[PDB]
Amino acid sequence: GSEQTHRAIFRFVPRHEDELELEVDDPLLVELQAEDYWYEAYNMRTGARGVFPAYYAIEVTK
Amino acid sequence: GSEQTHRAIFRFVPRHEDELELEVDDPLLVELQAEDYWYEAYNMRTGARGVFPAYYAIEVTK
């Protein structure tokens, strides 16, 4: 119950405290697709939670 | 030497004060391509300066 929703496609190294670090192909569970084009999610590989630029991830087919 | 170096390909709405807002197709002059995958640049359309995620722009070969 509650599974992967997206996948990171680009390396994202945070510059800000609220951001989620991403490594290519990281499995993601996106909680919100904010209006300002930022995604709020959990990185299923690292377990960390944070935000990142929307275009850094693609949708995974349920 | 203030010629265009890149062009934004994705919409980027800042969440942090040091970021540079981007609209698809904005011509950019990237001053620094930082090691943490963030670009420091000048938006030639708005005249604003700031940083943004590297993968949000492509390099012009003109």
Curated annotation (Swiss-Prot), chains A, B:
The lineage of its organism: Eukaryota, Metazoa, Chordata, Craniata, Vertebrata. Residues 3-62 form the SH3 domain. The JNK-interacting protein (JIP) group of scaffold proteins selectively mediates JNK signaling by aggregating specific components of the MAPK cascade to form a functional JNK signaling module. Required for JNK activation in response to excitotoxic stress. Cytoplasmic MAPK8IP1 causes inhibition of JNK-regulated activity by retaining JNK in the cytoplasm and thus inhibiting the JNK phosphorylation of c-Jun. May also participate in ApoER2-specific reelin signaling. Directly, or indirectly, regulates GLUT2 gene expression and beta-cell function. Coiled coil: none annotated. Forms homo- or heterooligomeric complexes. Binds specific components of the JNK signaling pathway namely MAPK8/JNK1, MAPK9/JNK2, MAPK10/JNK3, MAP2K7/MKK7, MAP3K11/MLK3 and DLK1. Also binds the proline-rich domain-containing splice variant of apolipoprotein E receptor 2 (ApoER2). Interacts, via the PID domain, with ARHGEF28. Binds the cytoplasmic tails of LRP1 and LRP2 (Megalin). Binds the TPR motif-containing C-terminal of kinesin light chain, KLC1. Pre-assembled MAPK8IP1 scaffolding complexes are then transported as a cargo of kinesin, to the required subcellular location. It is found in: Cytoplasm; Cytoplasm, Perinuclear region; Nucleus; Endoplasmic reticulum membrane. It comes from the Eukaryota. Phosphorylated by MAPK8, MAPK9 and MAPK10. Phosphorylated by VRK2. Hyperphosphorylated during mitosis following activation of stress-activated and MAP kinases. Highly expressed in brain and pancreatic beta-cells. Weaker expression found in kidney. The SH3 domain mediates homodimerization. Belongs to the JIP scaffold family. This is C-Jun-amino-terminal kinase-interacting protein 1.
